[PDB]
From a paper:
The second primosome is the oriC-independent PriA primosome, which requires PriA to recognise the n′-pas (primosome assembly site) and initiate the primosome assembly. In summary, the ssDNA binding protein DnaT, the N-terminal end of which is crucial for PriB binding, exists as a trimer in solution. Biochemical and structural information shows that the DnaT can cooperatively bind to ssDNA to form rod-like nucleoprotein filaments, which indicate that the DnaT-ssDNA complex might function as a scaffold during primosome assembly.
Although we also determined a higher resolution 1.96 Å structure, the electron density of dT10 ssDNA was very poor. Further degradations in the DnaT84–153 fragment might release the ssDNA ligand in the crystal and lead to crystal disappearance. Consequently, the incompleteness of the ligand electron density in the 1.96 Å resolution structure might be attributed to the protein degradation that caused ssDNA dissociation.
Author numbering:
A (entry chain D), B (entry chain B), E (entry chain E): 84 to 154
C (entry chain A): 84 to 159
D (entry chain C): 84 to 153
The structure:
Amino acid sequence: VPMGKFAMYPDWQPDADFIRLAALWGVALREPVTTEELASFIAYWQAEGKVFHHVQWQQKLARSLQIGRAS
Amino acid sequence: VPMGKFAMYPDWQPDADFIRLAALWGVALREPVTTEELASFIAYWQAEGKVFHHVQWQQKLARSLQIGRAS
Amino acid sequence: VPMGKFAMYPDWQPDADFIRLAALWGVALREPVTTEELASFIAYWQAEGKVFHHVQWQQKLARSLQIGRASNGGLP
Amino acid sequence: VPMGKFAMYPDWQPDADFIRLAALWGVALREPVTTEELASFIAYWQAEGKVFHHVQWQQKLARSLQIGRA
Amino acid sequence: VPMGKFAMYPDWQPDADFIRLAALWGVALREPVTTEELASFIAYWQAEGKVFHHVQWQQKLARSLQIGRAS
DNA sequence: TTTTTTTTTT
């Protein structure tokens, strides 16, 4: 929701069509994002404090889910 | 594509001879660039908003593919 | 050496003295510059169009190699 | 100190208290200038051929080290 | 403080409302001048030895800060 | 006054 680059924050959410976006970027997710996966992602990146644009954060989430679920 | 430096944009494509160029720059690609790889690259850099010449964008794409496909 | 300040051009070479020069500037290169590293460097800077003296181009190349080879130490 | 505005030259050195001067100009250097850093700075500016006063060259060195070490 | 043109000297200061003046001249400073920025400016111009009026020195300071901070 | 190339939780 902020414009420009921002640090991750507790109530951030990816777009409603995140699963479709992820597929367009080459990450096939076969299950929806869970509240726990999102919370874990956010806690990690909120602590890290690095700043990204919303679309870039969604790409990081897509990649993180792909790796997390592969294991 | 535009002349001079430009921001990345949705229907950007690398050159038809991108694979040859990438090889000349030390990146041996065995497969053509996928629709998804290109879409992901573009979304990331479009958000970033930095401006480069066409040839410089192609170099970034080559390097990104090298890393992306290595894993 | 090529004289004056010039834009990067396709046939540019850092010369035979490069590795010694790089070392004097604090960049220890163990392997010579590859054809591909050089071609990539040249294509980037030729597009950029900035103009430098030969020694200043060599410094940029040294720095670029140091960073490029740092994920490893050596040539990709 | 070298007098007047001059082009950079191979044997140039900053002052013995360069670190202190740099700090006064807002550049906190943790480690002294290395032989290699100085040589690189001199080669760049010697090629460029621009002329500056000694203090102005020291300011350029301070700024270059700040960036280089970042 | 001297009237007319003068060479830059160690104890020189710009006006208390320098930030506002700078803005009126088209230089938007986000932070006050620091003691280190001022010392650096003075050392540079003192060596140069050129002479300017007080207002002209302030303009040079504004421009120098704009460039210095843009990096 | 104006030196500084380089996309990443696992």
